[PDB]
Each structure stands twice: as C-alpha cells, then as structure tokens.
Design a protein that fits this description.
Chain lengths: 288, 313, 306, 296
C-alpha cells in the first residue's frame, strides 16, 4: 500500500550480503559491486516485461492495427531507453579500482552471468531450466517480426506488385546508366537482391535471419518510410536495430569489465544491411 | 551462484502490481515499481559511501593523504551515481500520465532513505522532500549526528595557514586586495573620458564593494543566521585558501573534494527538480539555494587577479 | 575535395587571438574562440532548419502529411542540435577562471559580447524582449509561435457545428466534477477524505478556469500565456487525443516545440553563468504547451471521436 | 569587441556552399552535412592546439615541475572532453535519413579523399601508425618527422624515479616478490595458476618484449613499461596521483578516438590499432598487493 511496503523494500533493501564481510574481512567496494548488478537485474526484469508483452501483441495477430502498432513501437522504444541507461551505468563500476576489487574478488566465484539476460537473448532471440527452455521453444521476437514483415500489403504480384516492378525498374536503370566507373560492383549487388538461391544459402550460412519475403517487406517499409501508412512500421524497424546495437554495446562493456578485473552476429542484421540496396529515388514505383 | 550471491530470490520477487491484485492489471505499474526500486538501491549505495566518508571525518585523520584520497574518490563516486539517477528520469518520461492514473490508486514520495540522505548532507528543513509517516530511531540519529556540511566545515576551519602568526593568509589577502583595488583605480583614471570608462568605473565600484565586503565578519554572521550562508567565517577562509592555492600540491586533492561537494549539491538539486516535475506531470491539477554548499559555489565571486594572491612558501 | 567542399580555407583561418595580436599570447583564448565559432555554426544550422519550417507554415498546406513530416523532423533536429549545444558547455568548463582573466581585458568590453544569430533565433521563435536589416526583418516577419498558433487555431473538431470539442468538454468536465463531488462527500469522515476534498477543490478550479475566456485574455495581456484561447483549445485537443493515430505526429510537434524552448532557455542560462563565473560580476515561448499537463482529466471525460 | 569580429564570423559564417544548389538542384540536408563536418574540423583544430602545446611542454623539459605537469594533465583531459562531444555529435547526422542523403550523395565528393587532413595530422602526432592534398603534404610530413606524443610519454615514463637499481630498485624487487609469491601460491593450493604463472613471469622476459615490439603488438619500450607499471601500482602515492591521471587521459583519448573513427565509417555505410595499448594491458599484470614492493 505505502512505499516501500508497496515496493517491498523489506526484500529489496535487505538483499545485500557482502561475502567479504561474512568471511571476516569486510571490503568496502563489494557493496557497490552487489548494488550495480542488482540494478542490472531489476532493469532486466523490466525489459523482459516490456518485450514479452510486445511478443504477445504480435502473437495475438492484431499487430497491424495502428493502435497495437503504436503500443509495440512505444514499448520497444522504452526498451531502447532502458538499454541506454544500462550502458551509461558502467561508469559506476569504473569508479572501482582493480585493486579494491582484488581485495574482494577472492570471496567471489568464477559462471557469473545473468539468467535474465540469457532469457532476454533467447526471446529476441539471438542464435528454472524450464524458463530457459520455454524461452528457447516459444517464438522469438525475430520470428514474429519476420511473420509480420511477410504479410506486408503491396507484395501481391497481382496487386501492387512491389517486387516485380522494382526489379524491372532497377534493370532499366542499370541499362540506362550503362549507355551513358567502376560501376558494376553496385550492380553485382543490386541484381543479387533478386537471387533467391543466394539468399536461402546465406540464410543457411547464417549471414541472414529473415526469410526472403520478410526481406521484401522490410525493403518496402524502408523505401516508403515517408508515406503515412509506413511511418510507424519504420519506427519499429529503427527500434529493433537500436535495441540490437545497445545489446551489443552492453555485452562489450560487460566483458571489458571482467578482463580489467581479471588476469556481426546481430539479429536484425538484415535490417542494418538494407542501406546497401539503396537506389536512386525515381527507381521507386509510384505509390498512388 | 549469481542469484544466491545477489539474493535475487528477494530482489526479483518484490514486484507486486497492486492493480493486478485488485483485478485490473495496468501494464505500466510494473515500470513505476521497478524505477523506484532501482532508485532505492542507489540511495542505499549513496548512504553507504556517505556514511563511510563521514566516519573518516569523525575519526580525525581526514587530512592524511590516503584518507583524503579515499574521501574524494567516494564523493566522486556519489556524484557519478547521482548523474545516473538524473538520467534515469528518461525512463519514467516514456510513461504517459493517463496510463499512470490508470493505476494511481495507492498511497502517497517519499523515500525514507532519501530523507536520511538529505539530513546527512544535510539540507535545511524548509527544503527537504516531504516525508511524514525502529526507523524513527534512524531518522532521529540522522538529524542529530554530524552532517557532511558540519564535518567539512570543521575540516575547513583547520586549514593550515590561516593563523596570523604563520602565513596569515587573511591579513595578507586583505592587504593585497586593498592595494590592488587601489591600483586598479589608478588604472582607470588614466583613460580618456568614455565611452567605456563608465563601464570600467561602474564595474570597479561593484568589485570593490564585493571584494572588500569579504572582510566584514559581522555581515557574514548576519547572512549566516539568515541562512544565505552555511559555513563559518573561518571555514570560508579555508575554502577560499584551497580555492586560490589549488595548483599547489597540498591543495589539489582538497580542491577536488570541494568540486565534488558542489557537484553533489548541483546533481541533488537537479534530481529533486526532476522529481517534482514528475509528480506534477503525473498529478496535474491535483499536484498542489538550497544548495548545502552554497558558499563553495560563491567562491568564484571573490576571484581576484593572480598577482593579488599572496605568494606561497 | 574535403577542404574545398567545406571551405576550410575560411573556417580554419578565422582564429585570431587578441592576446597574441597584442604581444601576450594566452593559451586558453584559442578554446574560447573555437567554442563560440562552433556555437555560431550550429546557430546558422538552426536558423536554416527554422526558416525552412516557418516558410512551410506560412504557405498554408502545413497539414499535408509530407509537409507535416518535414516540419516535425526538422524541429526534432533542432531539438537534437540544441541538446548538443547544451552538452558543449562541458568544454568551456575545462577552462579555469584565472586563465580566462589572463586574456579577458583584450576582450573588454563585455556588453560587446553577444551573438546576432542567437537573437535572430529568439526573434523568430520568438521570445519577448547590414545586420540591422537582417535583425529588422526578423522583427517584422511572422514568428514560429504565431505560425504554430495559426495552425492550432485551425484544428478540425473545434467547430461548434461539428464535433464541438470545447462544448462537449465543458459538459463532460462539469458533469464529471459533480459526480466526483458526490463520490467524495459520501465517504466516511477521514484523513483520506480530507485530502480528496482539497484535491477536488483545486482540480475543480483549474478545470473550470479553463473555460474562463476573460482570465485567458487577462493572462495574455500580462504575458503569462502566449497562445490565443482558440489555439489553446487546439493544443488541448491534440493533447487529449495524443494516442489516436491521426494525432500522433501533431503531438510530436508539440513535444519538439517544448524541448526547443527548454533547451534554448537552458543554453541561455548556462551561458551567462559562465560570463558570471568568468567575470565575478524559466521557459519562455511555449508556456501553454508546458501547462497542457495541468488540465488532464479522467479518460472517460474525454469526448469520444467521430 | 565586437563579438562578430573577434570570432571572424565573416569567414566562418560565409563558408557554406551547397554543391547541390551550385548545380541547380538545392538539397536541404546538404547544409547539415556541411555544418557537421565544419564543426568537427573546428574541434580538430582545437585538439591539435592543445596537443601541440602538451607535446612542446614535454619537449622543453621541466615536465616534472608540478605546475607544467598539471597543465599537461588538464589539457589532455580537455582533449578527452572535446572528443566525448565529437562522439555525441553523431546524433546530429542521425537525424538525416539515408534517402535525403542519397538525394545529394551524387554531387560529391566523390571521395576517395573525403577525409580530414587535420584528423590525419592528429593521428600522426599521437603516434598512430601504418591520399594526395598538395600544399599540405609537407605539413603532413612534418607531422611524421616530429616527435609523437607516444614517444614523449615513453621518454617521460623511462625517467620515472624508482626504476634506478641503485635507490629504490623497483623492477628487481618486483621480480623477487612475484617469483616467491608464485611459489607460495604453487604450494598453498586447477588451470588458472599455470596461466597466471605464465603471464606474470613472462613480464620479465626482455627479449619477448622486444619481439612483440618489433611486431607492433606493443608500443612502449621495456623500460617505459616498467615506469608505467610502477605508476599503475603506486597510484595512491602523492607523487603518482597526477602521473596516473595522465595515463588515464591517454587511454581515454585512445578509446574515444577509436569510437569516433568507427562511427565516421559506420555512418559512411549507413549513407552509402590502439596507441597506448600497453597502458590498457597494465591490468593483465595485476597482483595480490602483498606482493607490491613496499614504498619508502
């Protein structure tokens, strides 16, 4: 009811047991070491909460709905902001010298990784055991986003036929440029965009995570980002990329901390790679 | 054993959404809870550091180079944590006021720990965040025991070199400032008749009045009792000495301490300001200096040309 | 070519230390120069973005969604640049007081030291107070505030004939206040009950004062508010319906205007702080948008859409 | 006075020529692109100013005079703060969409040399190790011939009081304490001990150091490394507080410049190797602290 009965501070604020103190030689900085990681864990729980809620919204199948889409983008943004905070939080442990850590590491143990972070990685998902396993079997954010991308309106060959026209369009462009560098190299690539074999194979090699159709949808959102009906979807893509990056920045920081104290596989990678397939503006079919 | 080690069975089983318990789960309540729990963890950390620093002072031996180094490093740490706590407002900013009021069915904001913190520093009563509800004992100790302000004051008062039959810093300073002011006036008088001059003379009179006012003990006593200053006159002299001789080996680290204190004051103000804003944004219609170390902030006011500063030995 | 494209022959030959010119080189003067040159580059950028936005508004057709996007994105950009200019203050902090005093005199006189571009910026926003012509134009042409006002005044839904947002809102607020009063007076006498009565009294007042055109007229005349009553209704409509798809972007715009006001005011504050430290001797334009939060009502009191 | 004149704004604020505009198709975001890089160049000039002053201070001797040493640390710190700002400045170009960029990408440079002269100069003076701009190149050459920051810091480190084998004999004592302590850990006890033994004892292999040095996997002279390790271990000591601050600054600069160099290319793709490594590696030779030689 009242803070911090409401916040259960009897739990939160009585969960700090210094090993060094327990083993007769209290070390001041160990407290900081505990608090930093407990804070990391709290935010990990919050991120899991937001992420799982988004996952359900997708799973419920009404994601395309503009209200639901807004909720999703909003919560993903929240996850990104939390992640920036966590990246910034390393500055705290930077104020601990490696010596003062040595005065204590010794009551420490090797197996020093977060379960919650593992769960997080799974659900995203990157390439108590019931929770871990459940996180491994249930649908990842990547899969759900892939599904959503696959169902992007405009891909219908008979309808908008985005993929066909684009392809013809690039071609006329390649031809038009050839007659009037060093060029072929972009070419090598633009045309390669239409090589299902290369995409599936690279998919098997793990250099891509999205299905071919999903990639087509993603590229459609990319190209029509300025159109009204695509603003928020593009925001979602941006958010996914950002969360990716930040998760990478965090691992990296995390490791640094351990060497200092001791003696791109990324999952929306396809989204990041969208830029390589950038084309002159007119090569894009009129949208109305 | 990262779990048992971090007692996550406590930390990660302290998230009870009231809205969910009373049948109408509101998603953002979880965020509200987590953010405040994180704040509380860091308040615990800051109180840990601050209490350790206070003890170091109280023991005497603060001046010993090792101990002073400890103190400065931990105060710096507190500063860093505070910067993080300020950035943490960006999280709750991602929460809309209506979704808040979806769950705001429970009882009014304030942390006991934050109150202990303000007391220890310690802020004056007009200005602390509202807190009215074992613990009370704690609180009482926090109001009686010596604050960081008092201890730092004690420390400043004993700044070696303030004694008249030694360096006689204060006497020398009054002399050099008076002389310099006198020289400055001569400097102006030599100029042609404007347009600048008046600019020059006006600033001269303002500076003269401020700088000389520094040597008026009774005025200081007056401002002190009115609460526009917090440090004793002698303590102020010490601070000013550290301020002026900061580059000298024996003053680099003390000056770091001063900078840290000002930083902590600034950040705590910033935090309190962000906090208050949230309540208002969250409450809306229903919502209805100040720096402990204000004197250190005002040190810059008594800045004088380098040559007026008494030479060292 | 880089240097040619960026005209570094100009940019990188514009650093003349007075202290050196007058025989006594002072190392920190260079930093003092560079920081301010960087400031002015960014002010030129901000003026570029801002003027393009003002022009889009002035033309009518702000509402066409592409144009609305141009405006929102560029105003956002201004917000980001201003965040950077605020963080840039950390640089000038690295410079000690004594040392600045080592070179200041070459600077005197201080009232000399103010940016034309920063005032152009303020004019065009606009704060309430050869180059003189540029300044004059900025004084005569329409400010971002007036244009935003015009746009808000034109919000769809305020028509008393149509949706009647304001009419509906008064009715819903009045009714809701009556009901809330009855809910409260029905409680066991208490501690809690007392608090709720007070909160009701203020809430009641703030909410009802919202419909007092004359108070708004009055506050306008004192400058304690800047927007017309009608524009204010518009802003409030955007505010209450912010979650709705068609109001997402307008609200983004409002948020950006608030940020720009905050950040700009912060830069102004910080800046003089330094002049104060170096010498030893609130948020302006869009206050109405800042005050939007005070008028929040319970979700069910908000008129349903059509 | 006047502010406008003092800053030479007549140059700074008339240096913005949009190529897209010059060629009849003005593109709005091109202006942002130009201003961002001009701001980068301004700060680079500041960094070169600070850096050259620090370098000179080292070269003029009397670096050890605490006054000048303070100057060096504060200015190196300043360079660090500037670089943090430059890192945040990428947020500005992040407000430029790949489409809008692509609208003006065609008008320049092309490149290849769309890189800063000043940034290369800075790399040289720091000591970054391994394309035509004519007037300049001699200037660059001069940056290649004059002493790098790395070299001066190396010299400074070699002179660290305590290394002398007369007088404190830091390195020998260190060897004694580590060897004995390693024997004692050997007896008081699986993999980590043999690993720690290998790295810690290899610390005393001058030839391995010269080898790694010739390969460029280390940059400091062996003796310089001894000085650095001494500063590292005795950091709490009065005469080492400021030196350690300097080491920290150098590492920070190395980190930030890396961060910057990385972002200037990650964005080039979005639109289209450590100098003080030894200081970073100091942590690897961390030891229990009983083992650190007692100090005077």
């Amino acid at each position: 009811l009242i803070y911090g009965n409401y916040l259960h501070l009897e739990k939160v604020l009585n969960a700090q047991e210094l090993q060094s103190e327990t083993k007769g030689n209290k070390i001041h900085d160990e407290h900081l070491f505990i608090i930093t990681h407990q804070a990391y864990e709290l935010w990990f729980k919050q991120i899991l909460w937001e992420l799982d809620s988004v996952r359900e919204i997708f799973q419920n199948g009404h994601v395309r709905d503009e209200r639901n889409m807004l909720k999703v983008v909003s919560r993903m943004h929240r996850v990104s902001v939390i992640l920036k905070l966590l990246v910034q939080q390393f500055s705290i442990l930077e104020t601990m010298t490696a010596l003062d850590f040595n005065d204590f590491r010794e009551y420490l143990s090797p197996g020093f990784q977060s379960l919650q972070f593992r769960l997080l990685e799974n659900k995203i998902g990157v390439l108590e055991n019931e929770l871990l396993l459940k996180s491994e079997q249930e649908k990842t954010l990547l899969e759900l986003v892939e599904a959503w991308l696959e169902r992007t309106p405009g891909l219908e060959p008979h309808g908008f036929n985005f993929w066909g026209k684009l392809e013809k369009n690039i071609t006329r462009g390649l031809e038009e440029e050839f007659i009037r560098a060093e060029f072929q190299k972009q070419k090598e690539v633009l045309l390669s965009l239409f090589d299902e074999k290369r995409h599936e194979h690279l998919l098997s090699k793990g250099e891509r995570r999205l299905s071919y159709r999903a990639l087509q949808g993603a590229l459609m959102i990319y190209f029509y980002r300025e159109e009204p009906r695509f603003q928020v979807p593009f925001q979602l893509l941006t958010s996914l990329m950002d969360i990716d990056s930040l998760m990478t920045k965090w691992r990296y920081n995390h490791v640094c901390m351990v060497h200092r104290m001791l003696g791109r596989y990324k999952v929306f990678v396809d989204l990041f790679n969208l830029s390589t397939y950038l084309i002159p503006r007119h090569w894009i079919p009129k949208m109305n």
